[PDB]
Design a protein around this nucleic acid. Structure first.
Length: 240
RNA sequence: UAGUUUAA
């Protein structure tokens, strides 16, 4: 398990961060790890989800629903996480090498790059969503095959996430997970829709209590929960 | 930041 904080610096003044920055941040991270390691940057774009990143955390904010989030604080930080040590490596160097970010009209400098300590998984534990968890099912509109975004109150929901994890864990850990049973009781929730390119993505910010696997947890902890983790979704933090 | 606008 490896988790890092990347502190960012705003320029110029009265900085305003759009809410769907979500996609771009990932795009730029893919350029940056590309130049220095085109080979490891293939895992970044992998849909099977070898990593996660969080929202850009803004500690002092004024929320102005028209324009975006107001930055009142010196620096804002973003947290990348993953199970295999070598992606974090790539990104550390990659961004420290070309620390120029722009999301919409807000340009960014990479201030320091630290390493976050990983709070030891409990026996039974609780997670807050550090970036909205996504889960989807196939849905047909007439002829073509598109997908439909799920929320915890949809019933299929709990059942996709079981598949989505077991699928993902076998597809990276390389083997089937020993114990496949888990259940998550949902303590909080807010839905969100974020933009990517021309399309939309709906996912569930939420707090919740997970029980029933060492690895499914240790795994969802490192690489996040559900689908599309690579784009900045699924990352969780463990509060108790 | 138990939180972040907009609800196919």
């Amino acid at each position: 398990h490896m988790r890092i904080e990347v502190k960012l610096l705003p320029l110029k003044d009265n900085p305003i961060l759009p809410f769907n920055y979500n996609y771009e941040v990932y795009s730029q991270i893919l350029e940056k790890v590309n130049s220095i390691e085109p080979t490891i940057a293939k895992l970044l774009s992998s849909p099977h989800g070898f990593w996660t990143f969080s929202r850009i955390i803004v500690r002092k904010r004024k929320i102005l629903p028209d324009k975006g989030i107001e930055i009142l604080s010196d620096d804002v930080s973003l947290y990348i996480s993953s199970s295999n040590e070598d992606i974090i490596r790539a990104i550390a160097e990659a961004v420290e090498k070309s620390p120029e970010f722009k999301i919409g009209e807000l340009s960014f400098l990479v201030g320091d790059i630290k390493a976050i300590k990983v709070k030891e998984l409990g026996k039974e534990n609780v997670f807050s969503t550090l970036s909205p968890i996504v889960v989807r099912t196939v849905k047909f509109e007439g002829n073509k095959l598109r997908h439909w975004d799920l929320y915890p109150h949809d019933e299929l929901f709990m059942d996709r996430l079981r598949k989505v994890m077991i699928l993902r864990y076998s597809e990276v850990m390389g083997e089937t997970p020993k114990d496949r049973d888990f259940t998550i009781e949902v303590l909080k929730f807010k839905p969100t829709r974020l933009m990517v390119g021309s399309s939309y993505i709906r996912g569930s910010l939420m707090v919740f209590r997970y029980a029933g696997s060492e690895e499914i947890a240790r795994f969802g902890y490192e690489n996040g929960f559900g689908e599309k983790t690579g784009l900045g979704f699924g990352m969780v933090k463990l509060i108790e």
